[PDB]
């Protein structure tokens, strides 16, 4: 009766609160601004939830929600914001940044490696030798039992007698090249931890000092 | 031994003839059949791509040995002229104006002894001895007059019906001065002459012949050396 | 049975007409043509 895109439906029963969720995030941001101390601005990075879970463990609460939504709730103008000189803070307040309560040394030093994300530059020039596939670049003393991965690769790989075989040498990634989605997904099947989680501690919105530096 | 078939027929004794001096195969049909014969005897004996009376059944329509070859009166002058041109000098070729035209079905011969369907005419017996230079015995195999089709015979052995009695096998072998075996071919096909073609050094059998018979022919005809 | 009105019978008929099968008709008329 009308040409329109058919919408897929499922039964998750986990629909987000939408406006209520945004209000809850704003309330949490206000409480985090009302927290005791340590005035951190750092929430997430390219790392998975495991790094976030480990970071949350070493604290007695890192959370940002929708970026620039907490800043909007606080208000860019100093009149709306409860803090001082937040007009310049809001400009710096962007991306995955959130308050915490547990620090500086751990964030500066402890940087665990993790699988790379798209857009970055490869730390090296990974090359996949031809023949049987090597999951960990020939570190197995990486079996050839990857029966379903052969159909799921798409790259120059054919199944020979139940063994995945790359007919031609396929360079997985090269240093200085932007990490494509296909390159990142292909590297996911391998042990390429070409990333390092970082943090941002430029300033601290202390209750008394109110000096959030731009370092 | 070899497993080979003409077209898709196992009876290669009908569609071809083979002796110690030459090989006659059917025409116009499968040249793959000519290739099979040429693959084992091409450089040793001539392989004639011939016909008898405009038919492909030349194997059952002729009888011959290393010395002479016979054809029925039904053969044309053109086909007879063809055979003599292709065949070499030491092999003599003759037209046998004889009672039962199918010479292959009535006469099975080697270089020294021949077995004939008793119902042949005396002049035919005389010329066979004159041409083939063999002794002629007007006997029967398994009680059947068609000696040529039921007794595949060569210089080093012979095969007959499994039905024929042991005393009959001993009589035939002693009168032939050669070892004899009562065997089968082509999974119960009792026409041994029509399924197996034999010379003193090579033998061909139908594709449907099982390994047990092929071992038997190998033993009796001693092709291993 | 494939009928002579079949487009693929007609297609392969064409390719026979483009071998030496038709060459023995091209120069074959040239025989008389030089007489």
């Amino acid at each position: 009766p009308k040409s329109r895109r058919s919408k897929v439906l499922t039964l998750a029963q986990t629909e987000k609160k939408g406006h209520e969720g945004k209000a809850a995030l704003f309330s949490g941001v206000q409480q985090s601004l009302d927290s005791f101390d340590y005035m951190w601005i750092f929430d997430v990075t390219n790392m998975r939830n495991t790094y976030l879970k480990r970071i949350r463990d070493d604290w007695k609460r890192i959370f940002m929600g929708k970026t620039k939504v907490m800043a909007k709730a606080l208000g860019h103008t100093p009149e709306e914001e409860h803090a001082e000189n937040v007009s310049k803070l809001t400009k710096l307040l962007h991306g995955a940044v959130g308050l915490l309560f547990t620090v500086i040394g751990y964030f500066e030093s402890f940087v665990q490696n993790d699988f790379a994300r798209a857009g970055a530059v490869a730390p090296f020039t990974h090359v996949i030798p031809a023949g049987p596939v090597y999951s960990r670049a020939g570190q197995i003393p990486l079996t050839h039992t990857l029966e379903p991965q052969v159909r799921q690769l798409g790259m120059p790989t054919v199944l020979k007698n139940g063994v995945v075989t790359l007919l031609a040498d396929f360079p997985l990634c090269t240093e200085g090249q932007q990490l494509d989605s296909r390159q990142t997904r292909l590297l996911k099947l391998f042990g390429i931890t070409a990333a390092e989680f970082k943090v941002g501690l430029l300033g601290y919105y202390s209750k008394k000092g109110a000096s959030v530096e731009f370092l | 031994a070899l497993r080979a078939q003409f077209e898709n027929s196992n009876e290669i004794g009908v569609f071809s003839n083979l002796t110690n001096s030459y090989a006659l195969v059917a025409l116009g049909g499968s040249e793959n059949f000519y290739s099979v014969f040429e693959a084992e005897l091409g450089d040793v004996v001539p392989v004639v791509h011939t016909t008898i009376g405009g038919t492909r059944i030349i194997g059952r329509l002729t009888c011959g040995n290393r010395k002479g070859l016979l054809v029925p009166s039904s053969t044309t002058d053109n086909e007879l002229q063809h055979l003599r041109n292709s065949l070499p000098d030491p092999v003599k070729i003759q037209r046998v104006d004889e009672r039962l035209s199918a010479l292959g079905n009535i006469v099975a011969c080697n270089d020294y002894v021949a077995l004939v369907h008793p119902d042949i005419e005396r002049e035919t017996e005389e010329i066979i001895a004159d041409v083939l230079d063999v002794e002629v015995f007007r006997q029967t195999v398994a009680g059947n007059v068609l000696t040529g089709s039921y007794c595949a015979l060569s210089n080093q052995g012979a095969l007959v019906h499994p039905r024929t009695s042991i005393q009959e096998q001993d009589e035939l072998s002693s009168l032939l001065q050669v070892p004899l075996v009562a065997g089968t071919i082509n999974r119960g096909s009792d026409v041994i002459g029509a399924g197996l073609v034999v010379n003193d050094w090579c033998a061909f059998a139908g594709l449907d012949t099982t390994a047990t018979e092929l071992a038997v022919c190998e033993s009796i005809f001693k092709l291993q050396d | 049975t494939s009928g002579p009105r079949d487009n693929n019978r007609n297609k392969w008929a064409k390719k026979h007409l483009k071998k030496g099968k038709r060459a023995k008709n091209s120069n074959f008329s040239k025989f008389l043509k030089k007489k």
Partner: protein, 137 residues
């Protein structure tokens, strides 16, 4: 079972033995008479009684014979023909009597020695009959 194991292919020739015709038994299997009841490989020709020829296969009943071979309709090969038929060579042939042999559907004949002349056509087609033939012209 029709046209089965008959080696090559048969040229067209005149039709001699229609349905319900009597032929002599040609082999020494033990039979005397055969009765044609049906002919293999006959199309939808309206009001055409199927007919047989040399080298053809027909369902036959042993009209005169020992009771064991009787009572079982089974195929038979017409080995001879009385109607004049012309070879592709051009010569015209015909025999005294219509004769047929008793054969299993596969192609091996049930006899041991056939009697009298054999049609050169059927000897060409049927190697089994050519294996068990006495004289062919």
């Amino acid at each position: 079972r029709g046209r089965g194991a008959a080696s090559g292919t048969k040229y067209r020739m005149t039709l001699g033995l229609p349905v319900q015709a009597i032929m002599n038994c040609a082999d020494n299997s033990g039979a005397k008479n055969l009765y044609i009841v049906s002919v293999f490989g006959t199309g939808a020709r309206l009001n055409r009684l199927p007919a047989a020829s040399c080298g053809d296969m027909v369902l036959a009943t042993v009209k005169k014979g020992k009771p064991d071979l009787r009572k079982k309709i089974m195929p038979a090969i017409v080995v001879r023909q009385r109607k004049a038929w012309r070879r592709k060579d051009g010569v015209y042939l015909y025999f005294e009597d219509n004769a047929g042999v008793i054969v299993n559907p596969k192609g091996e004949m049930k006899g041991s020695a056939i009697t009298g002349p054999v049609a050169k056509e059927c000897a060409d087609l049927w190697p089994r009959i050519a294996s068990n033939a006495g004289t062919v012209v």
